[PDB]
């Protein structure tokens, strides 16, 4: 068990702190000409969607308490790296300039089974012609994560889609309703290409809202799993969805356990996991942790005749797909495919 993640962002100066696993030492990231990318990369590693802003700090005046020495970034390996721990070497930072960055505030309840308002501020309702069809989880104000299966050819007219947020009850007039610009679905979700296909695999879609949702105590984004963060067998997470929003505390079940118990002898496919039987389609599967020195809820699964373990899209396996689809398809209108 790793109770503390090897990448940290400071609560006082917002400085980035990276752990040297072999030396057991915390180090500061050395400042370079590609500070924007590293700030962004460091926030992504910790499960944040992006860096809001980054800053340049100096040891001479900024202190260096809690760290010893520095890590330098490989600026040549950085453009196509999926990890920060692979592109960093132990170095001496002569100028003593280190990286500080403010990440997007993510996965927290802003407190000042029927549910009460504010417990899951990321939970959204996706409505087609007024009717609730699929669930979603806000990753930001104008980005929702859900299932690909939510958009069959039948429900592809985007101007007929709406995203309901900041309300537990579907009839609540307090909750906000916004339209949809693009729907980025995984090109690897085969039941779309084949209507006789067995698969639940690559059942992930990114809903981009035409305008950002105001972030309130009722509306907030959820965290993505951290880079390398494990899905613990026996860890009890929460699944939410629907006309008042309900929650269920469900345990994570081993691949082996579900595969050894399945009645039809069906094996859980790659990029997917199972969880105990207590389930709204595309709805969230969130777990809480303190690996970032603060309790944060993270989106671990997507809901993809039986009282059997539910099968979910394992979100940690689509981290890059999510970070790429947003970088690439921000300016897109309509249905979009992302391989």
């Amino acid at each position, epitope marked *: 068990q790793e109770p503390l993640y090897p990448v940290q962002v400071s609560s006082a100066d917002a400085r980035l702190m990276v752990f040297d696993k072999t030396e057991g030492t915390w180090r500061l990231l050395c400042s370079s000409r590609s500070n924007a990318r590293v700030a962004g990369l460091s926030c992504e590693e910790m499960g944040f969607l992006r860096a809001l802003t980054h800053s340049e700090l100096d040891v001479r005046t900024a202190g260096a308490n809690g760290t010893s020495g520095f890590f330098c970034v490989d600026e040549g390996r950085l453009p196509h790296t999926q990890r920060l721990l692979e592109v960093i070497s132990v170095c001496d930072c002569p100028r003593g300039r280190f990286l500080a960055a403010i990440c997007q505030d993510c996965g927290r309840r802003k407190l000042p089974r029927d549910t009460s308002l504010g417990r899951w501020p990321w939970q959204v309702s996706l409505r087609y012609d007024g009717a609730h069809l699929c669930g979603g989880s806000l990753l930001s104000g104008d980005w929702v994560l859900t299932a690909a299966h939510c958009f069959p050819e039948r429900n592809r007219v985007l101007s007929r889609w709406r995203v309901f947020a900041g309300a537990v009850a579907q009839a609540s007039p307090h909750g906000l309703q916004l339209g949809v610009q693009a729907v980025v679905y995984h090109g690897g979700y085969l039941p779309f290409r084949d209507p006789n296909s*067995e698969e639940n695999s690559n059942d992930i879609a990114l809903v981009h809202l035409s305008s950002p949702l105001p972030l309130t105590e009722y509306i907030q984004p959820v965290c993505l799993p951290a880079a390398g963060q494990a899905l613990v067998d026996g860890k009890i997470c929460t699944v939410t969805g629907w006309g008042v929003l309900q929650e269920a505390r469900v345990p994570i079940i081993s691949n*082996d*356990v579900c*595969n*050894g*118990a*399945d*009645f*039809y*002898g*069906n*094996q859980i496919k790659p990029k997917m996991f199972c969880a*105990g*039987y207590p389930g709204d389609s595309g709805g969230p599967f969130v777990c809480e942790d303190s690996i970032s020195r603060t309790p944060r809820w993270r989106l671990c699964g997507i809901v993809s*005749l*039986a*009282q*059997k373990p539910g099968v979910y899209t394992k979100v940690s396996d689509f981290r890059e797909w999510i970070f790429q689809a947003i970088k690439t398809h921000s300016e897109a209108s309509g249905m979009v495919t992302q391989l």
Partner: antibody
Amino acid sequence: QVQLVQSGSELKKPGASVKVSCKASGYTFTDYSMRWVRQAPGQGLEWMGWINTETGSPTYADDFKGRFVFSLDTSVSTAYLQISSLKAEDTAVYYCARGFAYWGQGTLVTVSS
Amino acid sequence: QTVVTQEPSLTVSPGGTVTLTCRSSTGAVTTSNYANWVQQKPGQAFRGLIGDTNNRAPWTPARFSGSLLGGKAALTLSGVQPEDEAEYYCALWYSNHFIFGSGTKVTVLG
């Protein structure tokens, strides 16, 4: 047409070995696992474990560790079971199953001196 | 030492309804035991009827219901046919393995 067909009855002496077969058809063999169940004469049923077919990795029930070995041959889509150093108590009808939904007819293994 | 207990033999008349219980010796049968029911008709191969407490197999009809009845796993056979006569085995999952109940012979009374 999901079908499971097992090899014929075996008559072995104590100390010998036996490779019992289970041919699968009517589905993509790699998408679904295979499990082994034993029934000794007039006795109950025993889940012996299962074999992962996309990795080929076997899981064995406590009682079956050591002598028994689940193995595969994908090209011909068949699941195997080999019991080395056969003992008097290995006398049983051994079945293959893809979940509990689909079973083989069973293979009788008589171990006698 | 875990034993799964089934009624040795049960009678039912054509058209009648019968319920078969499955007991766990460690206590209450729960959804975590993902109770399966297997049928063996005379001379025929085994055929899974029910899995994960109440999931019906493609060949098992609607008159066949699997549930949890008073800390046990139960299998109901409604509007019984003389063809329903077989041996019924329940399998309970215990963390990492299955345990089969000794079995029940349901005789359709002819």
